[PDB]
Design a binder for this molecule. Structure first.
Ligand code: UK8
Length: 242
């Protein structure tokens, strides 16, 4: 079924376009819009816990857009609730981290944060310089790929739809969706002469490690200074918060 695979491509790309938060052309056009030294100092002088509150809410919103992305993938809603949650819990943050490279400018090592670009020194008050370096380095490695929007869409669909996540109840069902998405992805890369990015994708385990460190830090902050979540997905909220 040739056009069926081209269908799933069009349905993944449309779900991505509807949930990607900012258009790539907006992010690229804003690259010259950079925080001043005075603006950077204002961020650096904020409380740890205020910068935590800002970052936690940006990350919560980002996760919620990823959940909406997943929900709009043909086949995801047909999975059982348990498996939907298993996949989102394990992979939604991984997708957020991947999505970050669109907002990263490798020319000057800045990210688009709250309306302008700035470097990692913007986040000094968080006292997480190791994790922030690891996030910036990761986005720096991905930015070298010059990911197109469809490549990020199909790749992040596969970050989510991974039949190897422990605890799946209907594994064959997740496998079917996974194989169809893998075919869609490989067909698209062939069509665009972009198969060369396959060897350049992050090693399996690299994204897992960075996300587990990231989520562990967020859980520590949340334990010390809980934020109020505008909760839209009760079964998933219940798995992350306590
Ligand atoms: O609207 C809903 O109902 C809703 C919204 C977000 C949800 O979780 C966000 C999240 C966080 C996070 C974030 Cl973003 C910010 C602060 C603290 C955490 C913590 F404490 F959980 F670590 N970290 O990891 C995830 C995650 C990984 N996979 N899925 C989610 C869940 C449900």
């Amino acid at each position: 079924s040739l056009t069926e695979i081209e269908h799933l491509v069009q349905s993944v790309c449309k779900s991505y376009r509807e949930t990607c938060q900012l258009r790539l052309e907006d992010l690229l056009r804003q690259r010259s819009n950079i925080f001043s030294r005075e603006e950077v100092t204002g961020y650096q002088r904020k409380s740890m816990w205020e910068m935590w509150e800002r970052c936690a809410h940006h990350l919560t919103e980002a996760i919620q857009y990823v959940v909406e992305f997943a929900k709009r993938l043909s086949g995801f809603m047909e999975l059982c609730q348990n498996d939907q949650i298993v996949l989102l819990k394990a992979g939604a943050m991984e997708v957020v981290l991947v999505r970050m490279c669109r907002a990263y400018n490798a020319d000057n090592r800045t990210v688009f944060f709250e309306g302008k670009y700035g470097g990692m020194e913007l986040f000094r008050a968080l006292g997480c310089s190791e994790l922030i370096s690891s996030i910036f380095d990761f986005s720096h490695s991905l930015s070298a790929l010059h990911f197109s929007e469809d490549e990020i869409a199909l790749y992040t669909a596969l970050v989510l739809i991974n039949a190897h996540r422990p605890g799946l109840q209907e594994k064959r069902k997740v496998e079917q969706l996974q194989y169809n998405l893998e075919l869609a992805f490989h067909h698209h890369l062939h069509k665009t002469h972009r198969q060369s990015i396959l060897a350049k994708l992050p090693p399996k385990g690299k994204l897992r490690s960075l996300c587990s460190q990231h989520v562990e830090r967020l859980q520590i902050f949340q334990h010390l200074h809980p934020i109020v979540v505008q909760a839209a997905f009760p079964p998933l909220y219940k798995e992350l918060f306590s």
